[PDB]
Amino acid sequence: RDQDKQVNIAIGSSVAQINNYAKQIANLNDQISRMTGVGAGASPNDLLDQR
Amino acid sequence: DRALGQKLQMSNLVDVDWNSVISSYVMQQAALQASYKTFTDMQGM
Amino acid sequence: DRALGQKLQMSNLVDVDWNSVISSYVMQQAALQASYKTFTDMQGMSLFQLNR
Amino acid sequence: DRALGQKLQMSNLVDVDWNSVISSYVMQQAALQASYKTFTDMQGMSLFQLN
Amino acid sequence: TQMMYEQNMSGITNSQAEWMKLGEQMSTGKRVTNPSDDPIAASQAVVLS
Amino acid sequence: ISTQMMYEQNMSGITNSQAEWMKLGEQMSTGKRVTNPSDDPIAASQAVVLS
Amino acid sequence: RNGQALLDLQNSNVVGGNKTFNDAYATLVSDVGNKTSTLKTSSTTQANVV
Numbered sequence: 001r002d003q004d005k006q007v008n009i010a011i012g013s014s015v016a017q018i019n020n021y022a023k024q025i026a027n028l029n030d031q032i033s034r035m036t037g038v039g040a041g042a043s044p045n046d047l048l049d050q051r
Numbered sequence: 052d053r054a055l056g057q058k059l060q061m062s063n064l065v066d067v068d069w070n071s072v073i074s075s076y077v078m079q080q081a082a083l084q085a086s087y088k089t090f091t092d093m094q095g096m
Numbered sequence: 097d098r099a100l101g102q103k104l105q106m107s108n109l110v111d112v113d114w115n116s117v118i119s120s121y122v123m124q125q126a127a128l129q130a131s132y133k134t135f136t137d138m139q140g141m142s143l144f145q146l147n148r
Numbered sequence: 149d150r151a152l153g154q155k156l157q158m159s160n161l162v163d164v165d166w167n168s169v170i171s172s173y174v175m176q177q178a179a180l181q182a183s184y185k186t187f188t189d190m191q192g193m194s195l196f197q198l199n
Numbered sequence: 200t201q202m203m204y205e206q207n208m209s210g211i212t213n214s215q216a217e218w219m220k221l222g223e224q225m226s227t228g229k230r231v232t233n234p235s236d237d238p239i240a241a242s243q244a245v246v247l248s
Numbered sequence: 249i250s251t252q253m254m255y256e257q258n259m260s261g262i263t264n265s266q267a268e269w270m271k272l273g274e275q276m277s278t279g280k281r282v283t284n285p286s287d288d289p290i291a292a293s294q295a296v297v298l299s
Numbered sequence: 300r301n302g303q304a305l306l307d308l309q310n311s312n313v314v315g316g317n318k319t320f321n322d323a324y325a326t327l328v329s330d331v332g333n334k335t336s337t338l339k340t341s342s343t344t345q346a347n348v349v
Contacts (some may be wrong), residue, residue, distance in 0.1 A: 109298070130225075242328045
């Protein structure tokens with residue numbers, strides 16, 4: 001039973017982090033578009049790799 | 052024996068592997084030296 | 097016999113297992129040595145930040 | 149044993165932690181070397197004030 | 200000219216900060232300290248404690 | 249600044265490790281799990297009553 | 300026996316009623332962890348942008 005006590009709360013804590021991932025990438029991708037077009041020849045190579 | 056199992060399972064989470072960290076430590080020291088030489092040259096311009 | 101039993105009782109309160117403490121201080125001595133190195137290394141390196 | 153207790157009690161007033169002192173020693177040693185360097189370079193710049 | 204100085208200097212800074220962290224863990228001997236060292240497993244550490 | 253910080257840190261960690269080693273040395277030399285009221289007082293009191 | 304009963308309080312779910320005291324500490328820890336991680340990374344990314 002105690003093994004399950006660990007497992008359940010651990011996954012429950014897990015899920016929120018992926019929502020954090022999603023919103024972070026949402027805003028990041030919001031910016032990469034501008035930095036690509038406004039780059040107009042430049043490229044945020046770090047924003048390429050980091051995402 | 053239950054306590055022994057718990058004791059080692061804790062190490063699994065908290066502890067640090069000496070070898071990996073010392074290797075990374077030396078490597079990053081080398082990287083530091085590289086960066087410093089880079090700086091002093093570039094400032095030499 | 098009643099004295100013997102209490103004599104055995106006494107030790108568990110106050111005596112020490114020898115193997116645990118020995119192995120312990122050995123390993124902590126090794127860790128102590130390693131951190132000692134790290135101090136010496138880090139300060140000598142910090143010297144290069146300005147050895148220039 | 150009471151004399152030993154005195155001895156340790158003495159230490160608290162007069163004994164020096166070798167690690168603290170040596171750390172401070174190398175720290176101020178670095179300061180001493182660096183400070184020399186700054187004087188030298190500044191004085192060279194002064195020499196160039198006239199040139 | 201600024202950009203170049205900042206580029207290389209901040210290179211030095213992040214290289215140091217990396218080494219600082221490796222230095223932290225090595226000197227202490229603990230791989231994990233805090234939400235920044237372990238936002239996840241430290242909770243199970245509490246449980247097992 | 250952070251040079252200072254990290255050397256100090258090393259100092260903190262090394263001192264804590266040494267303090268552990270020194271308490272180990274205490275019990276080591278004495279061959280006793282306990283000698284003081286501030287080790288674990290209850291054991292001490294039980295020792296007096298058992299004596 | 301009342302002394303024996305007190306100890307069981309620690310085994311009770313009451314405060315964490317969906318949980319116990321243990322899990323209050325641990326879940327608060329997990330919360331600060333998620334916050335620390337996500338905010339740190341957002342800060343780093345926006346610093347890169349600027």
